[PDB]
Amino acid sequence: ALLVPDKCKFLHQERMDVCETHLHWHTVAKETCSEKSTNLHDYGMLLPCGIDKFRGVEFVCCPL
């Protein structure tokens, strides 16, 4: 479980049809925080579908 601090927002994204890399998900997360002028505070991999493969990510974006 992730603590959500200092008025940051919690976001999850999950696609049954998708089994992708950590590298993929870290970018998605980072591009989503970035897109709203907020930083990626940290993240977590959802549903292992293989070595370095997952179907989702949860993450925390904080205000600049």
Tab-separated table of C-alpha atoms in Angstrom:
chain	number	residue	atom	x	y	z
A	1	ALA	CA	0.000	0.000	0.000
A	2	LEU	CA	1.235	3.483	-0.942
A	3	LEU	CA	1.002	6.506	1.327
A	4	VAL	CA	-0.287	9.506	-0.581
A	5	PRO	CA	1.305	12.700	0.880
A	6	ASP	CA	0.988	16.483	0.690
A	7	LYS	CA	-2.004	16.753	-1.644
A	8	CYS	CA	-0.645	14.399	-4.304
A	9	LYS	CA	-2.945	12.337	-6.515
A	10	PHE	CA	-3.253	8.587	-6.819
A	11	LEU	CA	-3.609	7.068	-10.267
A	12	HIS	CA	-3.850	3.489	-11.445
A	13	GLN	CA	-4.006	2.147	-14.973
A	14	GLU	CA	-4.722	-1.407	-15.979
A	15	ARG	CA	-5.275	-3.183	-19.291
A	16	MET	CA	-6.148	-6.905	-19.421
A	17	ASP	CA	-4.999	-6.980	-23.052
A	18	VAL	CA	-1.580	-5.662	-22.093
A	19	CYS	CA	1.571	-7.339	-20.814
A	20	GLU	CA	4.355	-4.772	-20.927
A	21	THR	CA	7.730	-3.861	-19.442
A	22	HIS	CA	8.579	-1.958	-16.299
A	23	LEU	CA	10.319	0.474	-18.625
A	24	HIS	CA	7.029	0.916	-20.485
A	25	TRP	CA	4.999	1.543	-17.360
A	26	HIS	CA	7.505	3.863	-15.712
A	27	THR	CA	7.339	6.065	-18.785
A	28	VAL	CA	3.541	6.029	-18.902
A	29	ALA	CA	3.465	7.040	-15.249
A	30	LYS	CA	6.090	9.716	-15.739
A	31	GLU	CA	4.346	11.010	-18.871
A	32	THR	CA	1.063	11.241	-17.014
A	33	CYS	CA	2.424	13.223	-14.084
A	34	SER	CA	4.473	15.359	-16.433
A	35	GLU	CA	1.411	16.012	-18.546
A	36	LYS	CA	-0.258	17.750	-15.618
A	37	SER	CA	2.775	19.721	-14.458
A	38	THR	CA	3.334	17.500	-11.449
A	39	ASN	CA	6.147	15.142	-10.509
A	40	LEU	CA	6.125	11.354	-10.310
A	41	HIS	CA	6.658	10.617	-6.616
A	42	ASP	CA	6.765	6.846	-6.935
A	43	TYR	CA	5.046	3.859	-8.484
A	44	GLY	CA	4.186	0.180	-8.264
A	45	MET	CA	3.818	-2.685	-10.746
A	46	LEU	CA	0.465	-4.402	-11.043
A	47	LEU	CA	-0.179	-8.034	-12.045
A	48	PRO	CA	2.992	-9.902	-13.075
A	49	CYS	CA	2.630	-11.406	-16.555
A	50	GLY	CA	6.248	-12.467	-16.881
A	51	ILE	CA	9.786	-11.480	-15.980
A	52	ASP	CA	9.999	-7.673	-16.265
A	53	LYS	CA	6.386	-7.721	-17.538
A	54	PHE	CA	3.167	-6.367	-16.021
A	55	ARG	CA	-0.376	-5.427	-16.974
A	56	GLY	CA	-0.499	-2.176	-15.033
A	57	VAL	CA	0.912	0.426	-12.701
A	58	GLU	CA	-0.243	2.592	-9.824
A	59	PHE	CA	1.550	5.817	-9.088
A	60	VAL	CA	1.678	9.069	-7.205
A	61	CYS	CA	1.921	12.484	-8.824
A	62	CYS	CA	2.749	15.477	-6.644
A	63	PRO	CA	2.394	19.218	-7.266
A	64	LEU	CA	5.621	20.954	-8.243
